[PDB]
Design a binder for this molecule. Structure first.
Ligand code: HPF
Ligand code: HPF
Ligand code: PLP
Ligand code: PLP
Ligand code: NA
Ligand code: NA
Lengths: 267, 394, 394, 267
C-alpha cells in the first residue's frame, strides 16, 4: 500500500498539514483504547502513531511511562495489540497507522516475523525508538520486504551525512525531532528547524512530521509554516487520558475538543 | 562509523536513540585519544596507586585447601579504596569526562556500590554527581545512600517500572539524552552501548595484569584457571583480559543461581536467558516470552544486572571462557568458610566465585590445580543479610 | 630483672600480680629473640604484604588545603585489611604466641575493632581465640560481635564494674592469671605492663617507616609534623617511632575532648588526668579524687581507653611530642569535610587527628607547613552514628 | 608494734595454726560490716585481712568482685574505711589487722602518706595485690618507715631467687598462694606446697599463711600439717554474706558457725 503517500498528496492539494496523535495501545484498557482511537479519528486525526506497551520505554518522559504502566495493569500484550491493530484497520481503511516500538519487541520472535505480522494486520510504518540509523539495516530491510515504511528520527544535532542517510533509508514520513531529551508536553522545542526541513526536501526525504513537545495549536501551525508536512502530539493527548480515567465519557469529549483544535491549526 | 569495533561477534552494538549517538562517538574518540596519551596514563596510574591503593595483594589460602592438591590465591580487590573493584574504572571514566570538558556525572546504581564509587571519584575530581537508583533499592540500601550524600552526590529515586536497577539504567539514559552536552554518563559495568564494554574492560584490566605478574613471581607459572563472579561483567573481564591470549588459562565466570536455576529465580542470563536488545546492546537477557525485561534475583544485590556484558557472551560462544552458576546457599557457605578459615569477610557477590572454586577443589581433591579467585569486594556490607538468614534458620 | 627497660622515664613498669611475672618475662625474652630472627621477620613481612596489603598509600589532599600554604598527606591505614591499623600488631603478636608454643589467644575489646583484628589473625594462624568485651559494649557493637563469631572467636561479655573496656581488660588479666601456660594475652594498644608498650610500638612502627620513605620520595624532605589520634597510643606511636630522632619533625597526639574538657566528659588523661597505677602500668589516668578508675567519654568508641601508653606520657614530659584534644563536634566536622572533599570516609577516631590538622591550617592559612595525618581507620562503621546525630540536629 | 610476731609465738605455744578470714570493708554496709567483723573475731579469727573497695579488683574472682560492688553501692570510700579500721583497733587491741589493697589506692595521695595513715589507725600489714616484688621498693620502704609489715605473695610457679626475695622483703607473714588464677572458693589448690614452705623456713621468711580456694576445715588442717603457720579464707566467708543479705541475723549466725569450725581445724 501507499497510505502515507496518498495522505500527503491529498493534504498538499488542500494546502493542509497533517495532525497525528499518539497513544499507547491498550491504555487504560483494550475496549477504552479502541474507543479513544475512534474518537481521535472522528475528531480529525490524519494518521495515527500507536505504541506497543514495553517494560522499559527509555525515550519516554513520565506521561508516556505511565501510559505503558496503565496498559500493563490491564494485562495488555503484544499479541493483543496486533488484534487491536487488525480491528482498527478493518474499521478505517485509508488512515496511515504507524507503530512506536522498542527494539526488543521487534527482535524478540524474529525481526522478519515482526514486520510480516505488521503487514498482515495492515500497519503502514514502524519507528523503533532505540535503533539509530547505524544499527538499522536488518530492520529497514525487513520493513521494505513486507511493505512497511521504516521511520527514522532526524535529531536537532544532525549533520549532512545523517540527513542524507535519513533521507535515503526512511519511507512514509521523516520523524523530525523538536529537541533533545525524551517525550513530554511540559518541554517545548524552540530550535528553528527551517534548515533541516529544507535539506531533507533537497535530498528527497519522506515528508517531515515534527514531534516532541507539541501540545498546542500554534505549534502545529508553526511546524507547517516552517515547511514540515505536519505535526505529532503524544504526551498532550495521553495527559487527557490520565486526567480523566474516572470519567470515560468526559475523557472522550476532551480528546475530541483537543484533536479538533489541533487539526484545525494545520489548515 | 566508529574507530573501534562495537561488536564482539554478534553481541554488543549501539542501540540507543539517534539523539545519543554523537555522545557515544565523542566518548569513543576521547577514549582512543586518552589511551595514547602518556599524561592521561600517568594521571590515572597516580590515582590508582596513591589514592585507591593499587597494586592490591594476591593472597594464598592454605587453610582452605588443606588436604587437597588445589593451590588457591585470592586477588584482593576487597582492599581497594571503597571496598570493591568498581573504584578502578570510575577513576578512569571521571578523568575521561574531564578530558572531554564535561562538569557533571550521571550514574545508575542497584545495590549502591557503583553509586558510592561514582560519588567518591566525583568528590575527588571536582565533578557534580547525580545518581539514579530504583526506589525499592533506595529503601533497602540506606547506608549506601547516606555515603553518597556525605560525598556530595544527589541521589534520585526512580519509581518507574520495577523501581530497581534496570529502571535506574533507563532514567540515567533519559537524563543523558537531554544533558549530554554538559554531563557524562558513568555506566557501572562492562555492558551497555559501545564504547562502554570496551572502556570498562580497559579501565579494569589492571586486575588481571597485576594477577599475572604476581602469580608468575610466586609460582613461576600461570594459573590453571581464573574465576570471577558475573553480575554485569566488569570485575570478571578485568581479571580475564590479560589472560585471553594465554590459551592454557581457563576463564570461568560465575552467575548467580539464586534459589536454583529450575525455580526461575536466578540471575543467570548468559547461560539461561535469551538474546535480546536492551540497555543499548544485543546480549543475553532475563525476559518474558513476549520480550518484556525482567529482574535478576540473587541473595547478593550486586549481581542484579538483568543481562550481561557482550564480551562475555562472545567469549562463551567461541568457547574461550566457561560460565557456571552458584546458588544462594552455596555462596553463603563460601562466605562462612572464608571468614572462619582465612579471617577475610568477602562480599556475597565474590562469594559466588569462591564457592565455585571450592566446588572445583572438593569435587576432585586429588586434581593438581592452581586457581585464582577474583575477590571483587569486602563483605562488611553483607553482615546484616547473613545474620538475618542464619538467624531465620537457627 | 628484665632484658629491656620497662620504664619510659617515670612511666610504665610491670604492675601485675606476682603470678603473672613469669608470663611477662617469657614474652619479653621471646620478643627479643624474634626481633633478631630473620625467619620471624620474613614471615611477619610476608603476612603484612600479601595478607594485610602493606605498604599502605600516602595520599595527598589538595582539595582540602586549597587556598592555604598547608600541604596535607594522609597515611592510609584505612586501606589495611580489617579497616584499621590494629591488624599490623595482632599479626606480630600471633606469630609471637606461636613462637612460644601457645595455642590460645585472649584479647580485650571496647568498640570491637581489636576483637575483630584478634579474631582474624587467630583464624588465619590456627589459634583458638577468646575475646572479653564489657556487656554495655557488646550491646552497642552487635556488628563487630558477629564478625568475631563468624571468624571463630568466642566472645565473652563482662558484666562486672562499668561493663565496658577497663572491665574487659581486668577480665582478660584474670583469665591469663590462670591460663598463661597455654594462652597468650594479645593486648590491644601500646599500654599495659612491660613488655607490651614496647612490643606494640615495634609491631606498628612500619607506619612511620613507610611514611618517611613515601614523603621523602614525594616531597624530598621530612614532614613539619605528623599527627595522630591517641586512645591507648598504638597508631600514634607507630607513626611517631621512626621520627623520634628527627628532631625537626613535630609529633602531635590528639586525645578526645568529648563534650569539652571543662565538662569533665572527655577521654584526655594525658593532659587532663592524674598519674596512677592501673592496668599494669604507672601512667596518666581518668580517676576520681579517691583513686577509683573511671571511663573515657568520646563520640568515638575506639578512643575509650581510660589511660594512655607510658611512652606518650614520657615523650610529653620531655617535650619531644605535644598533645592536644579535639571535641566531638570538631571530629564530626572533619569527618564531613573529608567525605565531601576527598571521597574518603574516615573513622571517627582518625577524624580527631584530621580535625587538629584542619585547625593548624585554618588558624594560620599563610603558614607554609607539610603535614601528615595518620588515617588510622575507615569510617563505614560510624555511618549510623553520624547519621543519627545529624538527624537529631536536623 | 609486733602483733603478728606475738600471735605466732602464742599460737606455736599451743601447737595451733592461725585461721584468718577476709572480708571487704563496708560490705554490705558500714554498720553491718563492723558487726560482721566483730562476729568473725568472737568466733575465733586469729587475725583479719580487710579489703578496701576498689573499682578494678583484677586478682579477684566473682565472689569478691561482687563484695566490692556491694560496698560501692553503699557509698564506701577509702576515708570511711580508715575510720572503720580505727574503730576496729580501738575495740580489739591485739588482733593483727592486714589490708588487701590495689596499687592505685596506695599511690593515689602518696605512698608514704598511705602507710602513715595505716600506722595512725593501727593497721599491722598491707598486701598490694598488683605490686610484684620487682616493683615493690617504694612500697616496702614506706611500710617499714611506718612500722607496717609489707606482705608478699609467694606463687606456686616460684623459683629460688623469688623465694629469697620474698623472705628478705616481707614481714609479718608470707602469703603462700595455693594456686594460680584469681580468688575463689570454687577452685581448690591441689599442688603440694611442702617444698616452698621448707625453703621459706630455711631463708627465715615471715611465717606462711596459705590463701586462695581455702573453704573447708580439712584444708585448714592440711595447710598446718604441711608446715604453714595458718590459712586464710575469703571467698567462702564472703559467700555467706552474699547468701544472707536479706537476713542480717542469720548472716551473723552462719558466719559464726563457719569461722568456729575453720578455727577448730587449726588446733
Ligand atoms: O509525547 P510528545 O512529546 O508529544 O512526543 C511525541 C511522541 O510521544 C510520539 O511521537 N511517540 C514517540 C516517538 C519517539 C520516541 C518515543 C515516543 O513515545
Ligand atoms: O577468696 P579466697 O580464694 O579464699 O582467697 C583469699 C583471698 O580472698 C584473700 O586473701 N584476699 C586477697 C588476697 C590476694 C589477692 C586478692 C585478694 O582478695
Ligand atoms: C558491583 C559488584 C559486582 C558485580 O558487577 P560486575 O560488573 O559484574 O563486576 C561484583 N562484586 C562486587 C564486590 C560488586 O560491588
Ligand atoms: C582502636 C582505634 C584507635 C585507638 O587505639 P590506639 O591504640 O590509640 O591507636 C584509633 N583509630 C582506629 C581506627 C581504631 O580502630
Ligand atoms: Na547479569
Ligand atoms: Na586514653
Amino acid at each position: 500500500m501507499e497510505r502515507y503517500e496518498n495522505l500527503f498528496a491529498q493534504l498538499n492539494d488542500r494546502r493542509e498539514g497533517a495532525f497525528v496523535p499518539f497513544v499507547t495501545l491498550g491504555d487504560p484498557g483494550i475496549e477504552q483504547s479502541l474507543k479513544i482511537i475512534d474518537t481521535l479519528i472522528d475528531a480529525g486525526a490524519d494518521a495515527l502513531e500507536l505504541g506497543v506497551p514495553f517494560s522499559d520505554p527509555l525515550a519516554d518522559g513520565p506521561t508516556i511511562q505511565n501510559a505503558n504502566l496503565r496498559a500493563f495493569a490491564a494485562g495488555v500484550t503484544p499479541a493483543q495489540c496486533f488484534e487491536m491493530l487488525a480491528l482498527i484497520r478493518e474499521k478505517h481503511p485509508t488512515i496511515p497507522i504507524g507503530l512506536l516500538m522498542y527494539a526488543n519487541l521487534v527482535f524478540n520472535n524474529g525481526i522478519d516475523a515482526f514486520y510480516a505480522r505488521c503487514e498482515q494486520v495492515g500497519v503502514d510504518s514502524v519507528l523503533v525508538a532505540d535503533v539509530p540509523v547505524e544499527e538499522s539495516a536488518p530492520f529497514r530491510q525487513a520493513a521494505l520486504r513486507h511493505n512497511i515504511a521504516p521511520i527514522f528520527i532526524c535529531p536537532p544535532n544532525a549533520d549532512d551525512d545523517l540527513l542524507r542517510q535519513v533521507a535515503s533509508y526512511g519511507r512514509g514520513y521523516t520523524y523530525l525531532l523538536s529537541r533533545s531529551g525524551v517525550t513530554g508536553a511540559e518541554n517545548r522545542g524552540a530550535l528553528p528547524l527551517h534548515h533541516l526541513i529544507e535539506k531533507l526536501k533537497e535530498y528527497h526525504a519522506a515528508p517531515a512530521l515534527q514531534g516532541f513537545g507539541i501540545s498546542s495549536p500554534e505549534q502545529v501551525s508553526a511546524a507547517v509554516r516552517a515547511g514540515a508536512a505536519g505535526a505529532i502530539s503524544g504526551s498532550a493527548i495521553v495527559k487527557i487520558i490520565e486526567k480523566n480515567l474516572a470519567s470515560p465519557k468526559q475523557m472522550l469529549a476532551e480528546l475530541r475538543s483537543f484533536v479538533s483544535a489541533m487539526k484545525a491549526a494545520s489548515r | 562509523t566508529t574507530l573501534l569495533n562495537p561488536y564482539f561477534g554478534e553481541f554488543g552494538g549501539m542501540y540507543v536513540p539517534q539523539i545519543l549517538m554523537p555522545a557515544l562517538n565523542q566518548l569513543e574518540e576521547a577514549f582512543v585519544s586518552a589511551q595514547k596519551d602518556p599524561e592521561f596514563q600517568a594521571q590515572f596510574a597516580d590515582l590508582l596507586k596513591n589514592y585507591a591503593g593499587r597494586p592490591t595483594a594476591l593472597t594464598k589460602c592454605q587453610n582452605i585447601t588443606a588436604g587437597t592438591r588445589t593451590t588457591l590465591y585470592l586477588k584482593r580487590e576487597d582492599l581497594l579504596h571503597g571496598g570493591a573493584h568498581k573504584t578502578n574504572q570510575v577513576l578512569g571514566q571521571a578523568l575521561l569526562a574531564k578530558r572531554m570538558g564535561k562538569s557533571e556525572i550521571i550514574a545508575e546504581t542497584g545495590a549502591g556500590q557503583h553509586g558510592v564509587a561514582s560519588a567518591l571519584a566525583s568528590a575527588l575530581l571536582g565533578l557534580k554527581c547525580r545518581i539514579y537508583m530504583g526506589a525499592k533499592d533506595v529503601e533497602r540500601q540506606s547506608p549506601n545512600v547516606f555515603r553518597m550524600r556525605l560525598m556530595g552526590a544527589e541521589v534520585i529515586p526512580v519509581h518507574s517500572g520495577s523501581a530497581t536497577l534496570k529502571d535506574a539504567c533507563n532514567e540515567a539514559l533519559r537524563d543523558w539524552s537531554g544533558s549530554y552536552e554538559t554531563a557524562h554518563y558513568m555506566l557501572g559495568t562492562a555492558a551497555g552501548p559501545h564504547p562502554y564494554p570496551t572502556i570498562v574492560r580497559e579501565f579494569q584490566r589492571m586486575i588481571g595484569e597485576e594477577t599475572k605478574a604476581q602469580i608468575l613471581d610466586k609460582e613461576g607459572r600461570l594459573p590453571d584457571a581464573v574465576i570471577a563472579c558475573v553480575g554485569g561483567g566488569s570485575n570478571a573481564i578485568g581479571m580475564f583480559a590479560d589472560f585471553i591470549n594465554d590459551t592454557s588459562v581457563g576463564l570461568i565466570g560465575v552467575e548467580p543461581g539464586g534459589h536454583g536455576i529450575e525455580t526461575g529465580e536466578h540471575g543467570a542470563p548468559l547461560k539461561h536467558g535469551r538474546v535480546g536488545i536492551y540497555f543499548g546492546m544485543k546480549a543475553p537477557m532475563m525476559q518474558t516470552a513476549d520480550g518484556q525485561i525482567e529482574e535478576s534475583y540473587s541473595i547478593s544485590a550486586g549481581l542484579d544486572f538483568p543481562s550481561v556484558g557482550p564480551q562475555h557472551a562472545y567469549l562463551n560462544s567461541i568457547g574461550r571462557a566457561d560460565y557456571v552458576s552458584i546458588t544462594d546457599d552455596e555462596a553463603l557457605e563460601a562466605f562462612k568458610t572464608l571468614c572462619r578459615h582465612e579471617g577475610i569477610i568477602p562480599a556475597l557477590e565474590s562469594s559466588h566465585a569462591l564457592a565455585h572454586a571450592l566446588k572445583m577443589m572438593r569435587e576432585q581433591p586429588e586434581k593438581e590445580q592452581l586457581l585464582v579467585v577474583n575477590l571483587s569486594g569486602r563483605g562488611d556490607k553483607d553482615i546484616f543479610t547473613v545474620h538475618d538468614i542464619l538467624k531465620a534458620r537457627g
